[PDB]
Every structure is written in structure tokens, then in C-alpha cells.
Design a protein around this nucleic acid. Structure first.
Lengths: 120, 66, 405, 113
RNA sequence: GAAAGAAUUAAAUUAAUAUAAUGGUAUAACUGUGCGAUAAUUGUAACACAAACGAGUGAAACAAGUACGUAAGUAUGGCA
RNA sequence: AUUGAAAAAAAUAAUAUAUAUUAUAUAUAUUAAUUAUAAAUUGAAAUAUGUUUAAUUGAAUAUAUUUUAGUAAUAGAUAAAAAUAUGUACAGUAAAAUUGUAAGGAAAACAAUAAUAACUUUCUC
RNA sequence: AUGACCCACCAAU
RNA sequence: GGCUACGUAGCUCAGUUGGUAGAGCACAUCACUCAUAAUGAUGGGGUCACAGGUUCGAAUCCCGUCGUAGCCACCA
RNA sequence: AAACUCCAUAUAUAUAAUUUUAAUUAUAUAUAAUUUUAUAUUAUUUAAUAUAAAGAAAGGAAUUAAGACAAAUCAUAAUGAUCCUUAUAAUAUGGGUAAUAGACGUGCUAUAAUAAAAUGAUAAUAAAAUUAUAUAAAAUAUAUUUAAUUAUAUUUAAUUAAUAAUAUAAAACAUUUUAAUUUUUAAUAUAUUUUUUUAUUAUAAAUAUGAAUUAUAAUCUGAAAUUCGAUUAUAUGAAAAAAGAAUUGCUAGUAAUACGUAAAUUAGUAUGUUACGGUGAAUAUUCUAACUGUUUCGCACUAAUCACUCAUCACGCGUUGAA
């Protein structure tokens, strides 16, 4: 609702999933019990968060791995084989089916996003 | 095109009457990553801050030691 | 225009809401109906009755009615004094040594009208009634929650406040002062008034009435004890009686594990939740009201999944050890059993009752001329009894207004 | 007249500006003025003394170094050469930190590397 | 020994100067500034310079008043 | 002048008040202000009087009354960005170039780029 | 099989 | 040879008395058709031929070279 | 052509010792309708339109002629002719058919409230189909804390079929939710809406839709998922705001369905194919246009109007004029 973890959110917005949305390092199940440990009554919106509570919220996300911090981990896992002899690396570097999909036709998607630092 | 704030007539500071800008500042305690506290004068109203990421927990500043 | 439903008329709400809240009654033609009273039941047997203004007041605070109920058809919610229900049933209550009954039945067969028939008894019968409707609203995981290691029970502040207000407002104020704290109580204080000055709150034992305890203003992690004591005061004392009234209990007769995850993602039982304890225990007999006029009516309703609990508990199916908890909470069974709980399978409507209702239904012209002119009378009568599965009050209505085929 | 952004800019400008934020001038009585002068002058003198002390100490250290290096040159040429090297890229160690106002939880680290 | 000041020499007129080009410029004409906004005033002008004449250029001074400056003073439009 | 706290004066300037002299003097008295000036349903806050708590203080709180807040740059005798080019008075020095420096690059802004003899003052062994 | 080509559409008595 | 106007999106023609990043036609891609072509609906291209210069801002402007019809015409 | 035919429908008989249980069925058979009877208008000896009255009365499928398109198949097979026999013939391993600038056709999933998702154990409700180149139930363990669901793993009960398994049909129905939506809440009080009301303060174009997509781990099948399969969990969450000119299917149990179901081909994977059922419509015949059969008139065409045909220009080459 405020500047929670910088890119915050809005009120009325039940927190549970809200975290799955703005945050990239956390989503779905992770965000679910993330509230559980912080014990906030489920179906609870952002406006209701008692600022001090957000503080715990913040620390919690620090504990596990969130934000583009992991974007890189994959970026490296990508570069890894890519740096080795890896069909993927070609598929990924050229912007082509890294999942071996329809290069011949439906491949624009790959060309659109698949790239060295994919998640852009 | 150019976005501006259009100036009013400037107020004449007379020679000798110019006064130095002493901004309102609070004495603020910074507790670093470890428990070392340091006092610093600051314009924002907060008597105490505790920091998470500092030189005292960065590897570059101490190589030997959501 | 720019404001939502800027137009005074509000229908944007899901129609079931449009029916619930819209102040549409208004137009309803005023009908001079007889008043529901149990002492005068012989005069009003098998007739449509209006509740007393005092009865309505308590019923409204207790939320005795429901949105689904076609209560909008009339200037106020009405009922029939059915004899297999009102008359015969209320007699059990004013006569059974256990005063612990469960109003079951087939969906719509008005297992709820009855319960409200029962809060009707309590208004005049001058008791204290503590309905806990839509339990779900506390097992939903939507309202607030926090622990209370002075009771090992997760408590639900906000929810408790709603129930506490319901009991205090619906019940007659005088009928309340009559119970004076049977001891001591010392909790928080946040009454905007004497708050930053009086640190805590105090209730002297005999200068303070239960009405007062039920008017305190505590901080979240306190309302819980307020309830422990609220109940406890009323509970132990013997001056006026009680009617722990629970509708939709089914939901809590089955869906144990609530919605609120605890602190290890583990699910919180419906018994570690305070109101669950306040709700079941009394049912079981772990909590006793002194006054022999203690009354307890719990009642399952339709909007709710079914499972082996009730049937087995009540003895309508031998215990099957090898089943599944998702459909047989062995405990809930035990509680009921050790409580000697009895069932008033609400019976459907007889042909003449049908006529009756349909007669009243004619008055306010809450019908449809496809059958008012062009049909004799007996014709229709037999018809609705038929297009109503031979007895689901709601179907009659579903078949006499909603359906314009 | 003005946008919300324009308003916020004006507010920001005001924070920095001396417009209607500054007090009256610090007027003193003559006795008070004298007392102030005596406070300031004494302080200044003390500061000068401290500077001289430090400066003197530094000079003494320099003299001692000079005395040492001449002796080293006289005795062992190789040792003197080793001493007198260009220390161009010499960096203070990152453990020698600027002393804080109050000390940390762990005052001293006994283990390292 | 140190600080601080006052500065002094060198270098510079390549910057700049209302505008060409030259001449002058740091002793600053150039730049900042306070005040002011008056001398971008009013009568007699000697005397030169230039010069065929008509014209033009500098201008002591006498007198009336204005401005700024502690003062010396300076100011009869602008570095020419 | 009136309250706090617990005989007078004596520079300088300024203001106040007076009076001497074909002398912008003196005499007594006191040390104001020094970044401001209308116009603000609502923002903020002070005082005076209305209810509960220990006559009674504090709290809340209501009405009047006002005060604040109209938020705005220069704080420097400023100094080579743009602004006025005539007067006067005071004060200072530019440009280029090179080593640099988030984006910044040939080309933004910013910083640094001669010499200390002597002289004085202050501390000091 | 002989056998690479086809070109025009305008609105009523 | 200084010396008047013209050097545009593939083609033609723009724009004018500044308040600028146009037109069709051709082309690519659909569709229409049995298949063309018309017709229809979709995208492509201006260094508005080069230097330097101005008002807040010139395709425009000033300011003249690498370019387009040229300049001889007091003879006895 | 029609009719017989097959499914399907009405009745009737026979069979089933009602434990293969569905007797509301399954078949074998028989009859039945290409419906009939009567009156009244019209017409001209007896048809049509209305009305009643008797019956259950209603559909689908298969069959698509002769010819033509020198339509498709020499890769189902087969065969003539012609071409090779140390290679255009046979085998193993690996690779390929999965490559992608653009373009087309067909689907799937989509873009949220006259619509999507959890949940419903006295399991609301089906037909058709499979299962000796097998289906694989109950449980049991994990993913995960209860339990259910979902997906795998352990062991194989029963059934080789009106017996047991795939498989509790799902949609509908009910309740709960649901961005934008300030249409919300949550703190107060407010009260004859209580799951609600009202007064005040707060709550700054892709969402909780969409799952393309990207990592990591895990599981199936088989020697072997790397080019190259499937599944799930944790992550990721592009595009997509009902889509231009233009165009497709469908006239009744049809279309539509965010309704599921089965089989064949699989060691293994269906967004495809072939079948089954559930819910279940509006709109219509009056115009043009197109395709067909019947007919008029015309017809210079006849591999037939996608015919045929005309003049100039341009190319090359004869002959014969003017001068």
C-alpha cells in the first residue's frame, strides 16, 4: 500500500497474492506461508497492515531469495551451458525455441523474449 | 515548451544584513550493522536509525573478518 | 454518474444482495396480521402471524432472518404458526429435560424460520439469547486472528465484538442488569474517553452488571477473555436462562481445520479457535448454565456440505471406523453424543398450511394473475403442493413469484 | 494556477529558502558581548596551542626519521636501500577504521583471514 | 617551527569591451557590487585641433542647479 | 513606570528629547527593529470561558477570539551563466589549454593547474 | 496431346 | 565567369508570405476472382540535394562552392 | 427415382428360474404408416386449403446413376513400357522428416460479471465403448498436515465381459468468492436490513483474467527424450481490451455448449480422427447474386463464353502501288 520493499502496492489489495504480484523472488505458495509465519489473518488487505507489521514483512523477504537477485541466477544457469557447447545457448543466443518448439513458425515469442539476459 | 517556475521580484538583502543559512538539524544516532553507534547531525526528523547494509558488514571493507 | 450507482436506486449488487438490502419492502401493502405469542398459540394455530415489534428488534440484532428468505415480499418478515413446528416443537423446548435440540430437515423446509421462531420465544419468554449465525463468518479466515497464551486458544477479536454487540443490543437491557458479576474482572481500556488517563479497566463484583461487562472496550488481545467472562458470568449465574443458538452449525459440524494458517503453515482446527470452543463446548456439556431454563438449539441448514458426522452422531448410521476425516470428524460426534443432543426433523407443509400461506400470499398480491384469474382456487392449491415437491415452503414461493414461465 | 508537481517543487524550494523561517538577530548586552569575546579568544588560543603541539611532535618525528636513515646509510647500505623505497601505491588497511562515537558489540576480533 | 595576514613578483590586454577595424585597456576602459537614475542639466565659452567655406573635434574656465562619495572628489552621456 | 531574578553614570553609533554658534554642536535618556507588508470554508497553534479525574491541577472537549500557515530561491559588497549599455563609490581578475570526474562522448557542468624574499600578527620549542 | 495462354462492368423503362 | 531560378520519399508534384517531418502512382502483403487486372484495406521512403549563421523555432531562413536554361548584343 | 435395407419408434408374442439383475432391460420374431377417416369452401369427373377424429408417429443413415474434369493415386497393392544390377537393390549406427525471414489454411486456448474458480460422501443424472500385443480397484508411501482433490511410486483384488476395471459423468443446481470496482474494505460509532444499514477518516489500462513462456528439481515409457516425447511441483507471467476489408458451419434434438465420455493408432504423447450421450435455440422465403435440373427467346460459340473475335502499334520477311 505504501513504499513496502520500495515498489509497494495498494490498499484493498489482499496481501497474500499481492506479494506474488509485485515481488519476483516470491509467488504463489511462497507468498502464502510467508504471511503465515508473520501470522496475518488471511483475506487481509494492504491498507490494514500495521506499518510495524510491514517491517516484519520486509525482513521476511530478505531471509529467502527474492527480486531480480534470482533473475541473475537463471541468467547464469543460462549462460552456463550457453558458455559450454549447448544447443540451448545457440537457441537462447540466436533468440530461437530454447524449448525446441516451432522454430519454423510460432517462434516470434522466443525471438521476443528469449535472449542472454532473458527476463528483461 | 520549457517547464519553469516564473520568478517574482527578488527580495533585497542589504549589505551587512545577510545571514548565514543555519538549517534545522537533529542529532541522529546511527547504529551500524554491528552495535557500534555513531552520532551525526541530520535534517530529517529521526532520533535513531539502525542500518542493515554498512561497511561494517561488507566484505570489501573487512577482508580479514522478499 | 461518475460516482458508482450515483443513481439513488442500487441494483448493481448481485441480485441476491439487491433482494437482501434495497429498502424495497416499502411498497409492501400494510397487513393487519395477528401477533406471534406462545401463550396465545391456540388462537393463531395454522395462521400467518407477524412478530412483535420487540420480537423484531431482537430478531434483527440476532440476524434471525436471512437474505435468501423472500422477506422483501412483505413490509416485515412473517411466519406461519405451524403445529408440527412452532406449536409442537416449542413444547419440546419448554418441556424437554435436556433443552438441547437440532432443527434439521430438507433444504428450505425452513429450518431457519424455526430457529427464528425460537428467538421469538426468547424475546417474550424473557431469556437471554445468544445466536451465532453463519458460523462460517468466523471459520472463513477473513476476520482477524491472534493467540492468547492465557487460554491456549487462537482468538478472533473483531469477530467476538460483532457477536458481543448482537447479544447486548438484541436482549432487553433490564433483563441483563439482572446478572451481576459473580466475581472479579480486570482487562484493558481504550474507551476514547477515559483511556489515556485510566490505564486499565475494572469491574467491581456487585456494583457491576453483566450489561456493563458487555459494554467494556478492550484492545484486541483482550476481547477474548472478555468473552470467557461474558459467557462465564452469564453461564454460571442462575437468574435468567440461555439459548445458545447456532444456525448453519453444519458448517462447523464438519469443516474442522479452519482457514487460518497458524505459524508453520499448519492448519488451525476449529477447536483451537476460541469461538469454536465457546460454540462446541456448551453444546457438549463442558459448560453448563445453572438455571434449569438453560436452553440450547443448534440447527443444520442447507447451504453446507453434508457428511457422516450428523447422521452418525444422531445415530442414523452405525459408526464406520474406516471412513475419512474429511467426511467424519470423530470428535464432533463425541461431543454431541456426550451432550445428549436431540433432533426435531422439521416436517414439511401440509396441504392446508399451503393454502394458508397462499392466502396470505394473495393479500399483498405477491403472486401472478396467471393463477389468480383463470384458475379456480383448489386448482392452484393442489398445484403448488405439487410443484413444491410436496412441501418445501421456499419452492412454493419459488413457484409463485420468481418463476414467470 | 499551479499543478501538483509545481506545488511540490515550490514546497521543496521553500525547504531550502530563508523566507519566513529564520529567527530574530542574536543581540547581546555589552557585558555578555565581552564574556563571549573572552570565551572565543581563549578557545582560539587553545586551538593554536594544540596545533603547535601536534606540529612540534610531527617535526620531532621527522627529525628522528632523518637521524635513523643517516645512521642506516652509514652502517648497512642494503638495509638503507630497502627502507628508502617509493611507497606510491601504499594503501591503509581496511581494518584501521575511523573511530565511531560508541563501540560495537564485538569490540575486538581475535581471529582473522 | 607553525598559522594567519598583508600581499609582492612573474604572467596576462590572447579573455572581455554595446557593434566593424585599428588604437587603448588589468593603474583596469573589463568584471561584481551599493547607491542612484542625476551631468543622456542650463546660460557665457577662452583656447587650441582640424580647416577653403559651411561644417567638425578637444576643452580650461565663469555662472545655476542635480547626483554619488568620509573625503580627495567625479559626473555637461557610452574606452576612442 | 507596573512582574521575574535577587545611591547613579561614564565609549561608539543610533534613536528620543532638548538647547548653543553668521562652528552639522553638544546635554540628558534608551539601546527598538534588522527577510517584513492585503487577500486563506478547510491546515496548525495560543490564550479566555463551558464537562469528568486529585474548592482544586491535568486531560478531554466545545464557542468566541485571534495568531499563525498564501510555504519561492540572492544571505554574498556576490565577481566572466542570463538579466540595463548614462552617473558615482567600493572591490576583484580573465581566456586558453592539460590531469581528471555517473551517464559524459570532439563538443554539458565541476575541480585543480606560477613564485614565496621580505614585512607584520599569534602560538610555540 | 502442341496446347502457354483472357480479359473487362457498370448503374432504368 | 564572379554573374538569375532550379538539385526532394522509387515517379511526378509538394509546400508558399516561417509556427512541417503532404499528396497520389508505382512496390511489398492481404483480400476479390476460376486466374489476371481494375476496386477495396494495409505498411514501406524524405537527411523537404551540401557548408556554416538567426528570432523561442526556418522545408522555409541568411550566407556562397560541388550541380540547371545562360550571359558576347556601339562595326564603318 | 421410389421402395425394400440399417439404426430408431409404438405395440404383441417367445426367451431370462429376476444372483451376469439393467425386467425402466436385453435380444429373436410379428405387425405398423409412403398415415387414414369425415364435413365444409373452391375448382373440375375428383384434387388442394381449413376444420375436427384415429393413432406413437415423428427422424437419421446407407445407396450419389451415365459422363466429364486425360481430377487424385504407378507411396495400399498390382501390372505394361522404360530405365540399374559393385547400385537407383539389402543391412547396422547416427542424422533427418521437428530447419525458419516472410505468406497462407485449419484448429486450440484466449481476452472476466446475459462469467470464471475453489467446494457439495446418504455421492443429482447417461449412452456408446473397451479389457489374454490387458484393464489395472480398494488401500499404501510421498509431494503436503491433518484429511479430501490432484500426480507419481509399492501390491494386483476381480474380471477375459449384461459378472470385475477403466468410471462416483460433467455442465446445470446450491453456497462462497472475484480485478477495474471508491461497487472495496476497517476503525469507530450509527440500528426494526445483521451474511446487512447509515454518518465520519482512511484505502493512488493486463488483474486474483490470460497461461505463451524460463529456470531448477522430480516422475512415466522404454537400452536409449540429447536434435526430440509426456507429467508435476516450485518459479516466470509476453502477447491478448472481441479482432479491417473479407469469409466459414448450421433449419431441430440440428446449431451452441468453459458439457463431459469412449475407442482405434501407442513401449509412450492428441490442441487430431472416429463414435456416445447431457442441456438445448432463434431465425425462414420473401429479392437480388452464384451452382444446378425444367423451360423461353437468341446464339457467328462447339476441348463449347475461361468461347470467339476486331483494329492500331511493335518485330521479321514477300509482292504491288506514288514519286
Amino acid at each position: 500500500v505504501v513504499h513496502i520493499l520500495g515498489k509497494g502496492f495498494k490498499g484493498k489489495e489482499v496481501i497474500k497474492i499481492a506479494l506474488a504480484s509485485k515481488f519476483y523472488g516470491i509467488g504463489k505458495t511462497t507468498a502464502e506461508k510467508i504471511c503465515s509465519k508473520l501470522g496475518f489473518y488471511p483475506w487481509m488487505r494492504m491498507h490494514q497492515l500495521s506499518e510495524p507489521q510491514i517491517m516484519s514483512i520486509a525482513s521476511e523477504l530478505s531471509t529467502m531469495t527474492i527480486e531480480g537477485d534470482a533473475r541473475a541466477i537463471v541468467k547464469d544457469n543460462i549462460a552456463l551451458k550457453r558458455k559450454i557447447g549447448s544447443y540451448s545457448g545457440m537457441r537462447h543466443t540466436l533468440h530461437l525455441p530454447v524449448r525446441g518448439q516451432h522454430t519454423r513458425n510460432n517462434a516470434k515469442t522466443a525471438r521476443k523474449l528469449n535472449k542472454i539476459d532473458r527476463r528483461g | 515548451t520549457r517547464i519553469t517556475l516564473p520568478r517574482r521580484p527578488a527580495k533585497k538583502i542589504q549589505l551587512g544584513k545577510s545571514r548565514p543559512a543555519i538549517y534545522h538539524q537533529f542529532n541522529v544516532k546511527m547504529e551500524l550493522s554491528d552495535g557500534s553507534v555513531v552520532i551525526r547531525r541530520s535534517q530529517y526528523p529521526k532520533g535513531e536509525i539502525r542500518l542493515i547494509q554498512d561497511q561494517r558488514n561488507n566484505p570489501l571493507w573487512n577482508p580479514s573478518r522478499g | 454518474s461518475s460516482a458508482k450507482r450515483v443513481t439513488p436506486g442500487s441494483l448493481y449488487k448481485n441480485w441476491t444482495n439487491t433482494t437482501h438490502t434495497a429498502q424495497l419492502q416499502q411498497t409492501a401493502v400494510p397487513l393487519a396480521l395477528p401477533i406471534f405469542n406462545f401463550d396465545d398459540i391456540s388462537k393463531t394455530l395454522n395462521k400467518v402471524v407477524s412478530y412483535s415489534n420487540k420480537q423484531y428488534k431482537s430478531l434483527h440484532h440476532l440476524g434471525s432472518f436471512k437474505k435468501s428468505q423472500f422477506n422483501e415480499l412483505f413490509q416485515k418478515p412473517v411466519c406461519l404458526v405451524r403445529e408440527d413446528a412452532t406449536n409442537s416443537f416449542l413444547k419440546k423446548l419448554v418441556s424437554h429435560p435436556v433443552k438441547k435440540f437440532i432443527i434439521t430437515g430438507e433444504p428450505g423446509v425452513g429450518k431457519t424460520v424455526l430457529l427464528s421462531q425460537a428467538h421469538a420465544y426468547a424475546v417474550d419468554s424473557k431469556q437471554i439469547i445468544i445466536n451465532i449465525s453463519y458460523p462460517e463468518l468466523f471459520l472463513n479466515g477473513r476476520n482477524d486472528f491472534s493467540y492468547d497464551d492465557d487460554l491456549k486458544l487462537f482468538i478472533q477479536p473483531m469477530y467476538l465484538k460483532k457477536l458481543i454487540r448482537k447479544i447486548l443490543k438484541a436482549n432487553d437491557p433490564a433483563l441483563l442488569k439482572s446478572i451481576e458479576l459473580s466475581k472479579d474482572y480486570k482487562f484493558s481500556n481504550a474507551n476514547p474517553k477515559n483511556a489515556s488517563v485510566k490505564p486499565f479497566v475494572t469491574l467491581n463484583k456487585t456494583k457491576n452488571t453483566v450489561l456493563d461487562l458487555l459494554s467494556v472496550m478492550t484492545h484486541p488481545h483482550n476481547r477474548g477473555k472478555l468473552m470467557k467472562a461474558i459467557i462465564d458470568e452469564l453461564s454460571v449465574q442462575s437468574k435468567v436462562p440461555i439459548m445458545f443458538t447456532v444456525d448453519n452449525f453444519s458448517k462447523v459440524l464438519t469443516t474442522a481445520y479452519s482457514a487460518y494458517r497458524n505459524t508453520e503453515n499448519k492448519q488451525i482446527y476449529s477447536l483451537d479457535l476460541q469461538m469454536g470452543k465457546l460454540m462446541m463446548d456448551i453444546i457438549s456439556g463442558e459448560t453448563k448454565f445453572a438455571n434449569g431454563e438453560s436452553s440450547t438449539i443448534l440447527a443444520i441448514s442447507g447451504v453446507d456440505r453434508t457428511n457422516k458426522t450428523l447422521p452418525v452422531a444422531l445415530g442414523k448410521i452405525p459408526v464406520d471406523p474406516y471412513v475419512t476425516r474429511y467426511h467424519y470428524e470423530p470428535k464432533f460426534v463425541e461431543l454431541l453424543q456426550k451432550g445428549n443432543v436431540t433432533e426435531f426433523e422439521v416436517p414439511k407443509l401440509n396441504k392446508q398450511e399451503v393454502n394458508e400461506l397462499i392466502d396470505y400470499y394473495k393479500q399483498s398480491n405477491v403472486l401472478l394473475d396467471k393463477d389468480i384469474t383463470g384458475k379456480k382456487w383448489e386448482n392452484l392449491i393442489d398445484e403448488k403442493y405439487f410443484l413444491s415437491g410436496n412441501g418445501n415452503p421456499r419452492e412454493l414461493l419459488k413457484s409463485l413469484v420468481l418463476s414467470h414461465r | 494556477s499551479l499543478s501538483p508537481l509545481a506545488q511540490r517543487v515550490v514546497t521543496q524550494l521553500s525547504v531550502m529558502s530563508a523566507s519566513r523561517k529564520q529567527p530574530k538577530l542574536l543581540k547581546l548586552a555589552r557585558e555578555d558581548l565581552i564574556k563571549h569575546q573572552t570565551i572565543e579568544k581563549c578557545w582560539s588560543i587553545y586551538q593554536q596551542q594544540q596545533r603547535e603541539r601536534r606540529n612540534l611532535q610531527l617535526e620531532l618525528q621527522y627529525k628522528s626519521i632523518e637521524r635513523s636513515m643517516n645512521l642506516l646509510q652509514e652502517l648497512s647500505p642494503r638495509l638503507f636501500e630497502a627502507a628508502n623505497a617509493s611507497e606510491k601505491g601504499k594503501r591503509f588497511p581496511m581494518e584501521m577504521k575511523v573511530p565511531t562515537d560508541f563501540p560495537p558489540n564485538t569490540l575486538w576480533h581475535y581471529n582473522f583471514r
